[PDB]
Design a protein around this ligand. Structure first.
Ligand SMILES: CC(C)Cc1cn(-c2ccc(C(=O)NCCC(F)(F)F)cc2)nn1
Ligand SMILES: CC(C)Cc1cn(-c2ccc(C(=O)NCCC(F)(F)F)cc2)nn1
Lengths: 186, 186
């Protein structure tokens, strides 16, 4: 019944914002009563937090899998984790980003994983400098932070079809170019 | 009295969110009554729209002034328009960005100027390619879009002291590096 509530919420978020979905809509989709819903989750906001947590953790585990197994392709496969994972869950990505403004739990989840992904990026940049493949230009952690924030804003604008945005079919190549030139460029 | 309402709103936004400022707070700061306020603006939301419009137009006119008068310094002076203009109006930047979620007028203002600034960036990249100084890599407009979105997310995270963020004293150098390497890099 937890999995049913989560699947119903992801389905309804494709059609409309969390504000326009009632606990009643989630209960009915999951084939349970309203008070039975409140047994699994305190709010529709908690449901969105759990959906975002699952997608964020899916991306994180995919990146850890890559890390355990040419330089342009190495960066492209890594950026592709985020493109495919968040791009396969557009409605949860869109709602989860909007909830950063109103939920400290969502803002803290997003902050915690962004810090992890920036640290991972900086560690790889440092390793590339240590092996003599990348030049010692900007502080690695500062470069990593701006490239991660670029991907966050650019991927999510593309997925939402914002004006302006890079078209979704061009966004992976666009980001890979800017990561490789900025990491290897003198 | 319009200028007084605008100055009062900018002062109070430094201390708290628009949600926690009343029309009554704005009237009292401007030395007018509540109904006199409603003569100049329909809402506290309209006041924020006007403040954002003034800051956005200040940045735009500064960039047009530059455009009318080495390549790394050329990009740095241009990015610096946004760093100094928005960085001199942090409270209006912060509130105006948050209002994109809830005001179609604010989202449309932001979209309209971002399209203009991306078009300007692409035109300069095109001119640099035409003169043989930059290589023909990504589509200029796509590269411009991602670099503009990077600056939007990275500058505003720095100004807000978000975790994560590039420190404000390092953000101009960070962005200039990624613009120059991505525009001139093979
Ligand atoms: C496979 C490795 C050898 C290379 C590798 C790629 N990395 C990486 C880290 C973060 C992001 C990113 O896109 N971060 C924002 C995530 C957001 F916000 F878009 F969801 C993209 C790529 N890190 N290491
Ligand atoms: C002086 C010229 C010869 C060079 C020049 C610089 N340009 C430029 C355009 C946009 C932005 C930017 O930062 N855009 C996001 C604005 C935001 F969102 F940060 F406020 C930064 C620099 N364009 N041309």
């Amino acid at each position: 019944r937890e999995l049913a509530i989560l699947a119903t919420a992801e389905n309804l978020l494709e059609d409309r914002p969390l504000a326009d979905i009632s606990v009643d809509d989630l209960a009915k989709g999951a084939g349970i009563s309203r008070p039975t819903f409140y047994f699994y989750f305190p709010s529709k906001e908690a449901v969105l937090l759990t959906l975002l947590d699952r997608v964020v953790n899916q991306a994180d585990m995919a990146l850890q899998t890559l890390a355990e197994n040419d330089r342009e392709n190495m960066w492209r496969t890594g950026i592709n984790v985020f493109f495919e994972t968040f791009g396969s869950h557009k409605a949860v990505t869109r709602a989860g980003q909007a909830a950063r403004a109103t939920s400290v739990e969502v803002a803290e989840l997003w902050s915690t994983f962004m810090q992890k992904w920036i640290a991972y990026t900086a560690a790889v940049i440092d390793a590339e400098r240590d092996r003599g493949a990348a030049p010692r230009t900007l502080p690695a952690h500062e470069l990593a932070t701006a490239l991660n924030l670029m991907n966050e804003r650019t991927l999510f604008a593309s997925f939402a079809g914002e004006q302006p945005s890079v078209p979704e079919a061009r966004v992976l190549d666009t980001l890979v170019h800017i990561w490789v030139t900025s990491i290897y460029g003198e």
